[PDB]
Design a protein around this ligand. Structure first.
Ligand code: IUM
Ligand code: IUM
Ligand code: IUM
Ligand code: IUM
Ligand code: IUM
Ligand code: IUM
Ligand code: IUM
Ligand code: NA
Ligand code: NA
Lengths: 347, 413
């Protein structure tokens, strides 16, 4: 058996089932005090061995500096998301808003603009081009049926806290999820969390947090929130080293001050942004990406000089036409090309 | 539908079983009887003088491990005449709260008086295993309800086109006051009854006035559970919860169930008077807290991959003056996967059905409508965006009233 450690207040611990969304259960495993204890291991850690655990054969897939200590650095190795020529979303991302290991990405998403499809495509791109990366998809407040759709169909560690889970439990799934990923980076892995979404993560933390803040506006107690910020802020590359990429959605144009608000508190805190367009979605042009508002710092770290200059030109012409003319033009050329490579040859 | 069924359960039984029941009941000459006749006699026993009849109700298993069958007729809802179920039965048949148990029942004897279930004949309508509702794989609906019946019943023609409901839908009828929401429910209940007679239809009326219930009753048909303006709120929650549990047992046994919930808003309000204060809120003044409870309710709706489906179409009361109502509509945003939005403005002008089409839709409708119909609905939408509201709905109603069917209507596009 195997699972995700959960050191209890005394000193003993259980292993959580991913297939349980990391929630408590029998059959959860049991673990010494004491083993721990040396062994020397903390929460988030993944244990496997014979079972009730007679003994441990691997912690995190292996028989170590601490996360907060690791030296943070800019992302320096790109994710190549492009696979099949018809998946336009990832072809565009690789050009206009590349994502690297350690990226702190925001997908800005108005209602019904294909946010979930893009997530799955990003997830599948990394699975194909970067099989050794560990992929996690955390869904907070998700509709139950969207879970099974995302899970089959990507790969793919999908942990979910659906809108009918009790709030304090929704939170524990999120935090344990983060701890597990931090543990893995410590062990030199490249890790990705696709988070749908920060908005709802936020809202969950609102309901459950107690209740002292500097006055509401949500009604939202600044205390949030934290801790969602601390979640998103955890993304980083490291010297010593391993990366945590976080691509998280931020909801917009949903009609909620909550919500707004919320968005306001996150607006601009990413170092990679992919904005989705309602007008382009109503339109009904997909992927509904607003390329002009999308991008990443400091992208010559990710794009070679040749590519970057061409994308710059695409930008200037494009900034000189409507969004739909976009887009459209770019989607056509894409469109007619069996790779971004070839597409680039034509500039 | 009661009823209902009842005839329905007996029809599905092989002769051997029907014969065992008829004997138990001491029907004179049951072999000579035409089946349908035998079934009427079996039902008629209740109200004669034999003290064995054929009955059913829905299991509440008590902490001590014995149970009673609550009765739909009493909205579920304590009596005698409830039917006692022993621990032996619960254990041997592996029964659960919510199960519909049918059988030969001994009447109060003087004797032993209570009603006793002396012989169990069906569980959830299936002759005499179970995966739990919670372990089934939730999924999008993949089969549609066809609601359209009579060509002049416009609400359903529009729903079928603009906001299709399928088996497993979590649907929300957004209803400002008056409205016309009650009639929508009735017409939905109805289309499903004519076009899909095997679906179990439950209308759950939360804390509403008697007349409204009647009505309605009345009215339908469908199992109608309402329990009633003047009962304590923790009693009301209990009605709704047992109703839900029963639906879940049905799905476990592969039925397609529909609950038409009037309304979620009021369900929400009840859980507020009822749930141990959380110390936070809100406001409101509404918890929290839940909330989590009405959310679980609505959220139970789903198609499942390994069993039946639970469709929940719930009214959501909007533009009321509160407030606490508002907060709840807020808290339920993005939970559903189907929306039928009704217009306050189009209501005051006497245009029914008062539907705002452009704002109404259903997610993953490609699973429910063929490509042709989708693109044709799409243009209808384009043209609708080019006018009111009043004018769009009006044009469309007009084109509908000119046609014998929706497929007719689409031939025109
Ligand atoms: O595989 U489990 O509680
Ligand atoms: O990727 U989807 O209902
Ligand atoms: O609602 U706009 O690119
Ligand atoms: O993103 U710079 O020299
Ligand atoms: O269908 U006959 O007695
Ligand atoms: O005797 U004759 O239905
Ligand atoms: O079915 U009576 O009291
Ligand atoms: Na959406
Ligand atoms: Na607003």
């Amino acid at each position: 058996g195997e699972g995700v450690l959960e050191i209890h207040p005394e000193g003993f611990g259980f292993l959580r089932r991913i297939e349980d969304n990391l929630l408590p259960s029998n059959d959860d495993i049991y673990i010494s005090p004491s083993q721990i204890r040396k062994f020397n291991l903390n929460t988030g850690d993944i244990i496997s061995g014979v079972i009730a655990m007679i003994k441990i054969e691997a912690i995190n897939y292996r028989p170590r500096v601490n996360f907060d200590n690791l030296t943070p650095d800019y992302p320096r190795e790109r994710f190549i998301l492009e696979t099949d020529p018809k998946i336009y979303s990832t072809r565009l991302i690789d050009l206009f808003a590349p994502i690297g290991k350690g990226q702190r990405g925001m997908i800005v998403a108005p209602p019904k603009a294909g946010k979930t499809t893009i997530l799955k495509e990003i997830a599948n791109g990394i699975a194909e081009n970067h099989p050794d990366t560990i992929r996690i998809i955390l869904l907070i407040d998700e509709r139950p049926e969207e879970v099974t759709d995302i899970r089959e169909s990507t790969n793919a560690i999908v942990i979910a806290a659906p809108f009918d889970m009790p709030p304090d439990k929704q939170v524990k799934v999120a935090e344990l999820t983060l701890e597990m990923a931090k543990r893995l980076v410590e062990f030199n892995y490249d890790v990705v969390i696709l988070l749908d979404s920060l908005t709802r993560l936020a809202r969950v933390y609102n309901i459950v947090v107690p209740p002292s803040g500097k006055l509401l506006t949500g009604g939202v107690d600044p205390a949030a929130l934290y801790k969602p910020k601390r979640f998103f802020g955890a993304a980083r590359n490291t010297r010593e080293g391993g990366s945590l990429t976080i691509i998280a959605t931020a909801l917009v144009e949903t009609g909620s001050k909550m919500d707004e608000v919320i968005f306001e508190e996150f607006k601009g805190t990413g170092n990679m942004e992919l904005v989705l367009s309602r007008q382009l979605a109503n339109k009904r042009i997909f992927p509904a990406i607003n390329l002009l508002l999308s991008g990443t710092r400091r992208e010559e770290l990710l794009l070679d000089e040749e590519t970057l200059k061409k994308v710059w030109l695409l930008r200037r012409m494009l900034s000189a036409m409507t969004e739909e003319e976009g887009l459209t033009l770019i989607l056509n050329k894409l469109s007619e090309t069996s790779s971004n490579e070839e597409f680039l040859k034509l500039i």
